[PDB]
From a paper:
The infectivity of rotavirus (RV), the leading cause of childhood diarrhea, hinges on the activation of viral particles through the proteolysis of the spike protein by trypsin-like proteases in the host intestinal lumen. The RV virion is an icosahedral triple layered particle in which the segmented viral genome and the polymerase complexes are packaged in a capsid made of the VP2 protein. The external layer is formed by trimers of the VP7 glycoprotein in phase with the underlaying VP6 shell and 60 trimeric VP4 spikes, which project from the VP7 layer, that clamps them and partially covers their base. This outer layer is responsible for the first steps of RV infection: attachment to cell surface receptors, lipid bilayer penetration, and release of the double-layered particle (DLP) into the cytosol, where transcription of the viral genome is initiated.
A single band corresponding to the 98 kDa unprocessed precursor form, VP4, was detected for the NTR-TLP spike protein. The NTR spike displayed the VP4-C lectin domain at the base of the stalk (4A pink), which was absent after proteolytic processing. The density detected at the base of the stalk in the NTR spike allowed the modelling of the lectin domain in the chain C, from the residue T73 to residue N221. While no density was observed for the loop linking K29 (red sphere) of the α domain to the T73 (green sphere), an empty density was present in the region between the lectin domain and the β-barrel of the C subunit (arrowhead). Although the map quality in this region was insufficient for building coordinates, the position and shape of the unassigned density were consistent with the 222–245 loop previously resolved by Shah et al. that directly contacts the 414–420 beta hairpin from the VP4-C stalk. The structure of the NTR spike revealed that α2-β1 and α3-β13 loops that connect the lectin domains to the preceding α domain and the following β-barrel domain embrace the body of the spike and firmly anchor the head on top of the spike. Actually, these loops maintain the NTR spike in a conformation slightly more compact than that of to the TR spike. Furthermore, the external α3-β13 outer loops embrace the opposite β-barrel in the body of the spike, mediating a molecular swap that enhances the stability of this structure. In this conformation, the presence of the α3-β14 loop prevents the displacement of these lectin domains, acting as a “lock” preventing further conformational changes.
Numbering used by the authors:
A (entry chain Y): 195 to 485
B (entry chain X): 50 to 485
C (entry chain Y): 50 to 97
Amino acid sequence: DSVNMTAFCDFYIIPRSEESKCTEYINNGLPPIQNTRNVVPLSLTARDVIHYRAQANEDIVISKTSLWKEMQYNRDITIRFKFANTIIKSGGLGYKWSEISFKPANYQYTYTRDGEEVTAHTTCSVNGVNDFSFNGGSLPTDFVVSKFEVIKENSYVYIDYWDDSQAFRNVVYVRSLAANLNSVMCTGGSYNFSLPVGQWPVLTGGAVSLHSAGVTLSTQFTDFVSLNSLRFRFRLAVEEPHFKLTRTRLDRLYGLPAADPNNGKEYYEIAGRFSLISLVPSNDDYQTPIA
Amino acid sequence: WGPGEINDSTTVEPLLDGPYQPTTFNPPVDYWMLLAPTTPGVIVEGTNNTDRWLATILIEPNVQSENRTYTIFGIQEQLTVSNTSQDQWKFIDVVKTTANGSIGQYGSLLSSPKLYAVMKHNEKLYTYEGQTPNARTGHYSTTNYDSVNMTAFCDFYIIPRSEESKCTEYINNGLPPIQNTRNVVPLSLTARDVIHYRAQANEDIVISKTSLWKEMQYNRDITIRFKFANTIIKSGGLGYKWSEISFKPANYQYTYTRDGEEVTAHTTCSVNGVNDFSFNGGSLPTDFVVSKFEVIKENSYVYIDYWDDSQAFRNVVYVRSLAANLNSVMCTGGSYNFSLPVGQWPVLTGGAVSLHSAGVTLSTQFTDFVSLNSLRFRFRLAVEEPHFKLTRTRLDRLYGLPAADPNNGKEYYEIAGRFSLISLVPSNDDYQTPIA
Amino acid sequence: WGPGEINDSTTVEPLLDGPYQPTTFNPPVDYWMLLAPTTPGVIVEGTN
């Protein structure tokens, strides 16, 4: 078991979980499959718009007139964040990790406001990505990372809500949804990379800032039931502290890494307010019958 | 506003380094090859195979005139040395012109941090040099400039001549990791919570009175044509490792007509579900290296931005529903060739995915002043593809759209359909007739 | 209510996990060393 072998050229290695494919390799040898299709396509062959002769364009009106109100809605806002992350191991010898993932935020909160129990949803996504990696070398004992997202201040973070409280759930066709928000500490922890020999690297640091930014509106649609969206256009920032990295040759990594902002932190609280001016038809106290 | 979408952008260029795998090599022209071992002794041999066979040794200081054995070109014999220097490490340059000839040791480089560069450049050869934090350059009129070859046992660094500065400071001291250009905070009030602590009687206030809101629908046609935009970013070094081959958005124009009236439009491509992938032909510098090919699988939707300067977009802003039946057509790809100074040029050719409309997407960007607009259609993509062509690759004939060339050589892709409408805008007066 | 999120990952699906130069194996025990030769001869030399 204390063997020490030396291969003098370009050769391949494989761990346990792929013994079977190694057996078919030494049985037939299958580098090539070169066809990512299952079978004769179990789908429609081709259905385009034949005969695009659209005839004379004629218009029919569905319904009669309507009565819509215009109210400004200034509501204080306490929406609470927690950056979701999932861990998926990557194959190799043990220092060969590639998969760091991002999942949308899934949390629910409870607050009181004028007696209403606050129900709201929070889901987060990040773009303007600032990915990174570690080239510890190429020898199978080297540090290997394929993607290591270090979110820098040039990134835009998308936060989406399905806010259940009716205060949020009475506003569609908003003429102008303005708001004010707060800042978050959004720190970061560290992980380790484990090939069964030697001390393991520590991606240390992480103390980043967030500040105010925009918010937008969008909607999707299916056949007869649509899809509404409360999309946020927020950008991450940077602050004074530097984030050291020890026992590594790639150090002073600046910004949030992709690994872990939980660190035992309860949540990421960003309070603020809303101010929505909405076209609304449901506040007509007018067409009431007699008696 | 113009088109609105930001899908993905992985810009990674803070690195000024990147080694190879320690082996033998045949360096091309116009670079420097920065070695970096951790122990004194032989590192690499200069080989030309016709006229000159160079050699060099790095030596630990403080060891005055002595005698050390060395395995020059795999053949060992006894050699004399000298370290009158006692602080920084010496790096002699054993200049030899024939393997059977005398062992001519030269060179007086004085540097502890154990890094030096020798590589072909400008149809000529030279060397760096240095004593203390005063690094200069050696001058080597080596006959047979043209056939430089390196045979080593430790790691290198690939680095051109054009930026002599950074390398001369590396050989001066070395490479501390990335360190700087992150402190910009012109945004802070104080303490983050003194100024808002309230809830204070939330949303309730009137802005405007109500009016009549009828519907005036406009059921006419719509047509769209497609093309994609790509950026190719490779990695540094000799020019074989590559990084980025994918799509990017871009604003495109058309002069349409509809209902007997001309129409002008804006369009910008945006695609969901694009799969990065490394078609790695081998990490070694004489093989095929691309960090990622962003490829398409049927998990790809369409967020291609679309615009129309017709009456339609001016009309429909408050849309509760808008459906159609667009021309579900086939989309293919083009052909592109990769540049490899030695070997055979790898290629990308083929690839096709068919679309089917799966919804619409309106979007409005509210600024602090105004309300930017945007609109998109959703197409779900099914593959019927000519099996990607890319030679000298272990992986071939993959499915989806090619990551390099969408031009397709043909005219365009036909996308067309009709529309209903729903809206509420000021209309004529029905108050004038309040009775049947 | 319907969300929107974009993220993707696809790395080594053929598990092509042996591109390496001439080696110095002191590896973790218990693997399978695929041989990828150009011309047969001496391929690997082992030592206790």
